[PDB]
Amino acid sequence: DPTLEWFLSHCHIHKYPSKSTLIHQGEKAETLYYIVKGSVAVLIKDEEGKEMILSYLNQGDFIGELGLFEEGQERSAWVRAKTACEVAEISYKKFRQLIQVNPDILMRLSAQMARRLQVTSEKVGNLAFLDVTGRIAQTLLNLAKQPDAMTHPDGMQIKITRQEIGQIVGCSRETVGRILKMLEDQNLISAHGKTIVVYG
Amino acid sequence: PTLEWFLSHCHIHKYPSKSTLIHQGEKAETLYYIVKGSVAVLIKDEEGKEMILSYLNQGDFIGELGLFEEGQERSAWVRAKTACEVAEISYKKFRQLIQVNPDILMRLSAQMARRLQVTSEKVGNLAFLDVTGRIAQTLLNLAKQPDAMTHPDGMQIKITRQEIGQIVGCSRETVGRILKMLEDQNLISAHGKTIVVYGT
Numbered sequence: 001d002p003t004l005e006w007f008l009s010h011c012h013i014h015k016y017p018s019k020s021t022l023i024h025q026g027e028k029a030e031t032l033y034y035i036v037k038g039s040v041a042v043l044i045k046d047e048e049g050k051e052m053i054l055s056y057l058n059q060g061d062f063i064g065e066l067g068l069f070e071e072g073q074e075r076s077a078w079v080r081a082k083t084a085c086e087v088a089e090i091s092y093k094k095f096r097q098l099i100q101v102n103p104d105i106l107m108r109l110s111a112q113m114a115r116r117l118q119v120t121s122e123k124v125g126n127l128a129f130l131d132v133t134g135r136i137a138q139t140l141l142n143l144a145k146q147p148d149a150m151t152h153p154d155g156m157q158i159k160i161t162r163q164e165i166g167q168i169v170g171c172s173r174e175t176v177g178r179i180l181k182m183l184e185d186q187n188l189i190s191a192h193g194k195t196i197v198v199y200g
Numbered sequence: 201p202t203l204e205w206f207l208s209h210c211h212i213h214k215y216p217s218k219s220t221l222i223h224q225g226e227k228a229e230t231l232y233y234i235v236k237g238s239v240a241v242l243i244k245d246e247e248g249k250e251m252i253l254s255y256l257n258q259g260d261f262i263g264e265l266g267l268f269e270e271g272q273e274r275s276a277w278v279r280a281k282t283a284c285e286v287a288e289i290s291y292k293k294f295r296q297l298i299q300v301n302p303d304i305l306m307r308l309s310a311q312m313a314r315r316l317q318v319t320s321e322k323v324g325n326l327a328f329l330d331v332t333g334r335i336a337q338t339l340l341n342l343a344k345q346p347d348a349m350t351h352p353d354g355m356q357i358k359i360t361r362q363e364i365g366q367i368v369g370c371s372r373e374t375v376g377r378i379l380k381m382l383e384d385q386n387l388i389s390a391h392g393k394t395i396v397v398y399g400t
């Protein structure tokens with residue numbers, strides 16, 4: 001996009017190494033981010049430090065938007081780099097000037113906000129309506145369709161730890177192990193540690 | 201002013217109480233704005249049980265999620281709680297108003313942001329809390345809303361056990377049992393016609 005190139009001209013770009021934290025929950029929000037390269041996880045936590053992953057976000061995604069529309073808000077979640085990342089940043093105040101000049105850039109942001117609300121509402125449904133087995137089976141399916149899934153004789157090979165699965169579906173590493181064993185017994189997957197083949 | 205200008209481009213209509221304004225799966229081509237009344241946003245499981253994702257009220261946009269990409273479906277049901285007066289405008293015409301004054305899109309997007317914050321908090325509650333914890337957090341959330349009333353013992357709220365159940369994802373009977381327990385632990389009063397949540 002000329003429109004994205006223009007926007008990015010007004011930003012300053014910074015590099016975050018894998019596993020660094022871009023955004024901490026509770027911080028005062030005054031800036032917008034945009035992922036030029038790399039991927040992140042958006043995380044929230046329990047009273048006990050238990051993590052739940054709300055979303056992954058990737059190249060092309062805005063981050064830090066939820067504070068833009070009313071002053072004095074706090075970041076709603078943690079954002080942690082899943083890989084090395086390159087991230088453009090701009091102040092809300094400069095971004096609002098860009099909006100005035102060309103509201104197409106707010107349309108692009110708002111389109112992502114709408115999709116997130118859809119996807120997060122679908123997550124609420126999954127958590128409310130599906131048992132942990134159904135959530136795990138749905139998670140493996142979705143991971144198998146991701147761009148990073150390797151093709152396999154029997155289906156798609158994915159790379160994900162039980163910990164990560166637990167953080168997505170909302171259960172312990174141990175509950176994940178018990179259910180993965182069930183799914184292999186049922187001849188639906190194979191599991192070799194962090195490697196899982198989902199059968200087509 | 202801005203609002204007054206926007207409503208002049210809309211058609212306004214009345215929906216009686218209990219009438220469904222938006223059905224999940226319908227083609228999304230139009231945006232709505234609540235001039236008067238209150239609605240619930242609902243999803244359904246495979247057994248017809250409804251969960252309430254949100255209550256929305258006068259000044260809220262509804263049906264916004266399809267605005268940014270063509271050929272989408274309505275993501276949820278939206279049902280009138282009270283009778284509603286609702287302004288409606290095509291997505292095409294709204295996209296024209298945005299070029300006049302993108303504050304109208306800022307207002308809509310502020311609401312999407314809030315909704316994503318609320319719905320993300322719901323994801324955590326379902327992941328991290330048991331049904332009692334979820335009910336307790338729901339009472340706390342209701343106590344914080346502007347329509348709660350100050351009470352000598354805390355905040356007084358107005359909500360049926362059926363509504364709580366649809367918010368939390370449990371039966372009305374389960375709610376009634378758990379409220380009696382919470383009252384017994386001296387956290388709420390619920391034996392009256394409303395609920396008072398202590399220390400609120």
Ligand SMILES: Nc1ncnc2c1ncn2[C@@H]1O[C@@H]2COP(=O)(O)O[C@H]2[C@H]1O
Nearest residue numbers: 055063064065066067075076077116120
């Ligand atoms: N449910 C969600 N889906 C996708 N991204 C989210 C979600 N919740 C929060 N975030 C992102 O996490 C960021 C945390 O900081 P902000 O609240 O400023 O902006 C937030 C969003 O960019």
Ligand SMILES: Nc1ncnc2c1ncn2[C@@H]1O[C@@H]2COP(=O)(O)O[C@H]2[C@H]1O
Nearest residue numbers: 050051163166167170171172173327328
């Ligand atoms: N309800 C839950 N019970 C246990 N772990 C949870 C829950 N929700 C999210 N999690 C997270 O998922 C993680 C899976 O790996 P761990 O068991 O090490 O730690 C777990 C928590 O951080």
Ligand SMILES: Nc1ncnc2c1ncn2[C@@H]1O[C@@H]2COP(=O)(O)O[C@H]2[C@H]1O
Nearest residue numbers: 253254262263264265274275276315319
């Ligand atoms: N989690 C949510 N919170 C508040 N409103 C929502 C939520 N999910 C869906 N909606 C509203 O429900 C409407 C359903 O139709 P749309 O998807 O067009 O637009 C949607 C929003 O206005």
